[PDB]
Write a protein that binds this ligand. Sequence first.
Ligand code: ZZU
Ligand code: FE
Length: 330
Amino acid sequence: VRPWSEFRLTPAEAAAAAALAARCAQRYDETDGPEFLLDAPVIAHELPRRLRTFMARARLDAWPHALVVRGNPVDDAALGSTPVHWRTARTPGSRPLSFLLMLYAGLLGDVFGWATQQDGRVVTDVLPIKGGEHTLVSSSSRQELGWHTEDAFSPYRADYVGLLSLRNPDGVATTLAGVPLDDLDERTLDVLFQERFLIRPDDSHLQVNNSVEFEGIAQAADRPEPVAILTGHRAAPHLRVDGDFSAPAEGDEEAAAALGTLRKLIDASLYELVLDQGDVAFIDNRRAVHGRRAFQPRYDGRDRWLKRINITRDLHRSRKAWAGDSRVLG
Ligand SMILES: N=C(N)NCC[C@H](O)[C@H](N)C(=O)O
Ligand SMILES: [Fe+3]
């Protein structure tokens, strides 16, 4: 009925998962400490069985753009005010929910972070930062966050991007789109499968958006190597594109026409997913691009606030980029 797969916890199931995360928050010092990173995938085997069944099956389905879990309770009074910056965003009220996200993520794969993004944290924060309303990063607000493959520039980008909505009082929509296969002619499709496109790293990997891996980002922005936008099966391709940071190879007008066509087709097929408070989404970063609608920030303590995590099916595929730590890349 919809392009994502959806699961709704019963009150009993939701309370059991919450109790499990609360227990972890009492026994472990931090969510992305080495001890909990190793233990979380096994603790997650204790989550409610109906949820584990959904995650195991839905990950193997061929069609969904995202796996959506609704119905986690969040008490605004216990959670407290939305932080003013991500640096101070590991508040006690949000702590059990950060553990909950880690437990759900462990059913899907291996979590990791980036040395060049929010100080190498694995669980990151999405919130509006005053003065950054018209930027191209996820702390924007008044300017729409254009659609993108997460970390498109990198061969080590996530297979799944997890988002947990801590609060979203004005119902701001996440945007999604898949490959517009019904409108791509064969010739245009052929071009998108060839290595004729440049993809640069987005602004969230810049030094200015953080408090030696930055040299790799500079090389990627300065001298990008040509890559394909589409890979895999022609009838169900995987997608790698960033609307704001993608370009054709220099002088390649055939590739430019193909990228220009794809831009218009994705713009025309973008749809909206609203993550209400307590909703979790795992976006398939190979099948879909995602973004976020423009909204007016409040800055009154009740702004939209998400926790975010990157998930790969195999951490060993990124060995070359382990930044002195398997769980932080760069
Ligand atoms: N604005 C564009 N095209 N992409 C940047 C947004 C990304 O999701 C980035 N990892 C961020 O959080 O800002
Ligand atoms: Fe994103």
